């Protein structure tokens, strides 16, 4: 009897396949001849974009230990080539066929295929990915459509890539949405670049939910009255957050587009701009788009005619070339039959950690949990370890399955509370999920085992990426010590992130909000850092048209759109003319780096109380997680 069948092989499955080879577990892969969306995009030369996620969170530990030099954003091309390098290693273990039905019995599944060949496997893993409506727009993108108007009913990472590709062909963008959360993917800390996943310090949740809330939520909830923040200048961007019924912030189910702010874009790319664009580094600055009027927010229920294909905003009858219905993603699950009879219904919440479903035996899901920030790599690596342990270690299998139903109830209560299932429940802050999986496995770190201040910074401020949990113990990867070392030396041991928590431990919700925005350049959606870059923008648009071999006439003005922008930017034209963290962080960082190697338990009683609080980090009081204990 075949021990393991993996169905679907692209990216999600790589770390699990590796672990099965290490323990010489009998496995077969079954994967479609047609391949993935990256194959569609490759064949037709449309791999001319970059990832919305850092190298550090988007590539697996066993590649990072070889190829990590510096923080950066990898190209679509690089991400694809790394898929195709790992496919080549494992191609011999891959059967090219499509699975159409799984019949699940007590201790085995019967797998049917399109060819007619059937397979018996004790353990079955789905890593088949998602069907995506928006894929057609990207794969079959026409770059001649010019001076046309587009309406989008949802803002996600796909719409933003499309918007980034349209704007330089002088196409006009209207967002008919009920708000969206956008966040600068890159951020300055005292004039040094940090990708946003570097600054989440997730284990501070263990001190208290309240303190973690103040650490993260002011850029997302409209908590500052600072006129400089996008959600004050352009209030239509704000969302309805009355669904959130969890104390865990940021909440499961919240999505975010990550984008280049133009200042960060400039710093990296201004010096070889045409070459960088051609590699796939595209300016996708949605807040620069609203500021310049090249995108406009309009209310959710604005008048449109679907037959006449027209928008009417204030009083101009705008003919719209295309309406784009937003990205809805649904798992590519084949029919699964319970006791080889009853069709199985997929619901993220009715599975444990997005991986173990109920009423099925020895079936696991790999690649169906979405990270809020950073790459999928973080989630699928830790899931691969969870799945590998369940398949190979019956003790572990028994421990998890014994009370599966209760664990799932306890997880749902902590992360979703009494909220009705939503289509985005599958989205999780990465540094909670990876940490959650690591405690179920037992490759987690113990806060009480911190000896020095250096140790506290690794436990609390060092990002909760999958490789952090592969330094030592059951899933150790050779070279992780040298990686953690390199990362720490480049980021000042994440002291700047640790000092933020120091500074706001005595503040309330409103106070932290005002403090978050007291900076020269606050982290996200700082509209003071846009006007200065109008000249560069026009250099960029010209550079894009030179790469994409396109020529529109800029000397022809669409006076009607100029008119629709004014109506839109009404609050901005009121709020903008009404236009400390830097000092606190600066003083804080120098304090921490002076006592790096000082013993915690040693540190004296009666700076000031910043000591009492650093000693309690040995005994955090929100450490309980009922789905694990
Ligand atoms: C436009 C776009 C941009 C993205 N950008 C990023 C990014 O910047 N950072 C990031 O971290 N993530 C990103 N992602 C997400 C993620 O990297 C991709 O979705 C990734 O391809 C998912 O990996 P997977 O292995 O789960 O799925 P896939 O790559 O789709 O692999 C699944 C494979 O299984 C096959 N298959 C499906 N059903 C069956 C079946 N029944 N039988 C047999 N074979 C089957 C498919 O043909 C496919 O080859 C992006 C996704 C998209 C669409
Ligand atoms: N803690 C950092 C970074 C940060 C805040 N909220 C975030 C949300 C997502 C990612 C990063 C962050 C800050 O307050 O500035």
Residue numbers in the entry: 1 to 579, 586 to 612, 631 to 653
From the paper:
The first documented single-component Trp-FDH is AetF from cyanobacterium *Aetokthonos hydrillicola*, which catalyzes consecutively bromination on C5 and then C7 of Trp to generate 5,7-di-Br-Trp. More recently, a class of “single-component” FDHs has been identified. These enzymes fuse pyridine nucleotide-dependent flavin reductase and FDH on the same polypeptide chain, an advantageous feature in the application aspect relative to canonical FDHs owing to the omission of including a flavin reductase. The flipping allows the carbon-to-be-halogenated to be oriented toward the catalytic residue K258 and within the hydrogen bond distance to the putative general base E200, such that the halogenation site on two substrates is switched from C5 to C7.
We also inspected the structure of AetF in complex with 5-Br-Trp and found that V220 is in close vicinity to the Br on C5 (**[Fig fig1]**). We thus substituted V220 with bulkier residues including Ile and Leu in an attempt to reduce the enzyme’s capability in binding 5-Br-Trp. The crystal structure of AetF-AI in complex with Trp was solved to reveal the substrate-binding mode to facilitate the subsequent rationale design (**[Table tbl1] and [Fig fig2]**). The substrate was found to bind to the same location as those in the WT and AetF-S523A, suggesting that the substitution of V220 with Ile marginally, if any, influences the substrate-binding pose (**Fig. S2**). As the case of AetF-S523A, we failed to obtain the complex structure of AetF-AI and 5-Br-Trp. From this model, the side chain of I220 is distant from the Br on 5-Br-Trp by only 2.2 Å, a distance that may exclude the binding of 5-Br-Trp. Based on these analyses, we considered that additional steric hindrance in the vicinity of Br on the 5-Br-Trp may assist to reduce the binding of 5-Br-Trp so as the production of 5,7-di-Br-Trp of AetF-AI.
